C-alpha cells in the first residue's frame, strides 16, 4: 500500500520530510489542506487512527504516526540512513537538534507579531550558529561526510528560508552558499522543485508576519 | 573514565536528562554554571571540543555532544531503551515530540516579555495535548507499557512545571496526575528528589514571569 504524509499547503515542517522522501526517490501520495479546510481537519483529526491527533501525520500499514521529526526519521530509518552505532546515531541528532535552531529561529517570531524590531536581535546570533556548518562541511561533501543524511535537507531547507529574511546573511559562507547548490544538484530533487508538486510560498502560516 | 554532563543551574532541557541518568543508576559528575557565570561559558564554550557549542553538553571519551535531545537520545540508546525495530523507534519519537510540545509551550512567552499576554492562548490547546494522554496512560502503566522508557521522565518533568503556573491544572486527568506518582515511586528517583543533588527551582529558569 501506498503511505500516506498529511499537512497543510505550506512547506513548514513537512517540506523536509518530501525531500527525503524525493531523494529517496519513493512513491507516497500527499493529503493537503488549504488556509480555510480547517474543518476537514478538525473532522477528520480523531477518525483516522492517530494515538496523537497533529499535523503533520503520516501513514502507511504499520505505523500511523504523528510529530514531524518522528516521520522524518522513520522514513530514514527504515533505509539505514540512521547510523548503526551509539556515537554516529547520537551524532545525527546533534546535526538535527542545530539545523532546528536556525529553524525554529524564524518560526518563534515569524508569528510573534511585530517582526521587524525582533527579526535583529536573531539575525545577530545566527552567524555564531551558520558558522559551525561553514566550518563543518568545510571537508565533508554533505553534513555527515560522503553520504546525504536527513538533516542534509532539514538545513538545506533553514538556508532556503533566510535567503528570504535578508538575501545576502549568507556570502560570508560560500561552504554554505554552495552547499545549498550541490542539494539542488541531486537531479531527484531537481525534478522536483521544478516540478508541479512543489509549494512555493509560504514559509509559515498564512498568518505569520 | 567518569562522564561530563554540563547546564545551568536550573532544570530546562537537562532536568530530564538528569533523571533518565538517575533511573539507570549511572555514574556521573555534573557541571554547572549560575545567573552571573555567563563568561566562564562564553568561556570555554569553543575550548572544550563540540563541534556545535551550547548548553548543555554530554562528554564521555567517546562522544562530546551538544543539542539536549542528541544527549538523552544517547543515554538511552546506550541502554537499548531506545526499541530496536523502526516502528517501536518511531513511537517512542511520536511520545517524545509530543511531550515536548508541552515544555516548548511555556518558553517563547516566558522569553517573550510580560506573559501575562502569551499565557493561556496556549493554555488554550493545551488540553487535547494533556488529553492524548490521559487516553494513553488508561490501560499502560508507563507511556510506553510495561518499561520506562525516555519519554517518560521527559513527561513527568513537562508535569511537574505544569503544576507550578496553576496546579489545579492536572485535576480531570487522574491518570495523569496519579502518573507522577507512579515515577517518584520508583525507589532510584526518590533518592534523587530528597536529596541535595536535585535542584529545587527555579524549574524553568530565572527569567520566568
Ligand atoms: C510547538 C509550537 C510550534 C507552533 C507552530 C507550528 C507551525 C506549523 S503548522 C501545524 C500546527 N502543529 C504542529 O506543527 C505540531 C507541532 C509538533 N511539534 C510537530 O513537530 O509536528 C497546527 O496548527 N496543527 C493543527 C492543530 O492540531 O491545531
Same mark, same amino acid.
Given at each position: 500500500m501506498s503511505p500516506i504524509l498529511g499537512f497543510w499547503k505550506? *512547506?513548514?515542517?513537512?517540506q523536509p520530510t518530501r525531500l527525503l522522501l524525493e531523494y529517496l526517490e519513493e512513491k507516497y501520495e500527499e493529503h493537503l489542506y488549504e488556509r480555510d479546510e480547517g474543518d476537514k481537519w478538525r473532522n477528520k483529526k480523531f477518525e483516522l487512527g492517530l494515538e496523537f491527533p497533529n499535523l503533520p501525520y503520516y501513514i502507511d500499514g504499520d505505523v500511523k504516526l504523528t510529530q514531524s521529526m518522528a516521520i522524518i526519521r522513520y522514513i530514514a530509518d527504515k533505509h539505514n540512513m540512521?547510523?548503526?552505532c551509539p556515537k554516529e546515531r547520537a551524532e545525527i541528532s546533534m546535526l538535527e537538534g542545530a539545523v532546528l535552531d536556525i529553524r525554529y529561529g524564524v518560526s518563534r517570531i515569524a508569528?510573534? *507579531? =511585530?517582526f521587524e524590531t525582533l527579526k535583529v536581535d536573531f539575525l545577530s546570533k545566527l552567524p555564531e550558529m551558520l558558522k559551525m556548518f561553514e566550518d563543518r562541511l568545510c571537508? *565533508?561533501?554533505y553534513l555527515n561526510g560522503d553520504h546525504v543524511t536527513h538533516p542534509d535537507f532539514m538545513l538545506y531547507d533553514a538556508l532556503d528560508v533566510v535567503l528570504y529574511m535578508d538575501?545576502?546573511?549568507? =556570502?560570508?559562507?560560500p561552504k554554505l552558499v554552495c552547499f545549498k547548490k550541490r542539494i539542488e544538484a541531486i537531479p531527484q530533487i531537481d525534478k522536483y522543485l521544478k516540478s508541479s508538486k512543489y509549494i512555493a510560498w509560504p514559509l509559515q502560516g498564512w498568518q505569520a508576519t
Open positions: 505550506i *512547506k513548514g515542517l513537512v540512521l547510523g548503526g508569528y510573534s *507579531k =511585530d571537508h *565533508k561533501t538575501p545576502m546573511c549568507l =556570502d560570508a559562507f
